[PDB]
Amino acid sequence: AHSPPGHHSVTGRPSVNGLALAEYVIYRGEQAYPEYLITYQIMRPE
Amino acid sequence: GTILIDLSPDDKEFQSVEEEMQSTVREHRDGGHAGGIFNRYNILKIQKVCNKKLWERYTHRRKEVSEENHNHANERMLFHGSPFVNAIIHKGFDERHAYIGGMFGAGIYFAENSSKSNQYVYGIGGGTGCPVHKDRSCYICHRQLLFCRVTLGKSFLQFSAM
Ligand SMILES: COc1ccc(C2(CNC(=O)c3ccc(NC(=O)c4ccco4)cc3Cl)CCOCC2)cc1
Numbered sequence: 001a002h003s004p005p006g007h008h009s010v011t012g013r014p015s016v017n018g019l020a021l022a023e024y025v026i027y028r029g030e031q032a033y034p035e036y037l038i039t040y041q042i043m044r045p046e
Numbered sequence: 047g048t049i050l051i052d053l054s055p056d057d058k059e060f061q062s063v064e065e066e067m068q069s070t071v072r073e074h075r076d077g078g079h080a081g082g083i084f085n086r087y088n089i090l091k092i093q094k095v096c097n098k099k100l101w102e103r104y105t106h107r108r109k110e111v112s113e114e115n116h117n118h119a120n121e122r123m124l125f126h127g128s129p130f131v132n133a134i135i136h137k138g139f140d141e142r143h144a145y146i147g148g149m150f151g152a153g154i155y156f157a158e159n160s161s162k163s164n165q166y167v168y169g170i171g172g173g174t175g176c177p178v179h180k181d182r183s184c185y186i187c188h189r190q191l192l193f194c195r196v197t198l199g200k201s202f203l204q205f206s207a208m
């Protein structure tokens with residue numbers, strides 16, 4: 001895909017769940033730099 | 047082209063990245079179906095990704111965007127989760143591989159909630175979970191996310207029904 005004309009990205013902003021933060025979409029790979037690689041496990045709650 | 051520099055846990059940079067990862071976990075409406083059930087992570091390793099070509103390509107585009115948007119790149123630090131993380135760190139993001147239509151169309155997706163990106167590490171909707179146990183909520187297998195520098199420029203505001 002391509003950005004909407006006159007835009008460089010899309011912001012997907014949840015409007016129903018008021019605690020959910022945004023997502024974002026870009027359409028050129030040069031518009032991001034993968035700065036940190038994070039290796040992790042999810043933790044089982046107590 | 048790419049080297050990975052391991053950060054020590056006593057490094058302020060390790061600590062600030064860990065805090066962004068931990069503090070942006072939320073509950074998900076699938077009850078943990080896709081990404082598993084958790085409130086926090088065990089961070090095992092944080093590596094700085096160093097690639098001079100990819101960085102110069104990034105800063106070149108960032109300046110073009112900034113000049114198109116009243117000198118404002120609108121740069122953010124955002125999470126990316128997918129099964130393509132190991133290809134991304136060597137080759138850079140490539141929109142030619144990002145042809146899968148999600149909610150905001152084809153493109154390269156990032157999230158403010160680390161737990162949102164965690165839903166995609168094993169594929170769409172968590173895929174079949176980890177390779178070893180086929181468990182979307184695996185507490186054993188190691189996962190990887192990218193914490194990325196992203197130029198948004200002028201961003202189309204799409205309100206979503208989520
Ligand atoms: C198969 O698992 C998937 C996980 C998430 C997605 C969505 C987000 N995808 C992207 O953000 C995305 C980003 C980057 C790349 N690839 C590269 O940049 C790349 C470079 C070199 C090799 O690959 C591929 C994809 Cl699919 C999540 C929601 O649905 C829409 C697609 C699609 C499939």
Ligand SMILES: [Zn+2]
Pocket residue numbers: 176177178179180181184185186187
């Ligand atoms: Zn596993």
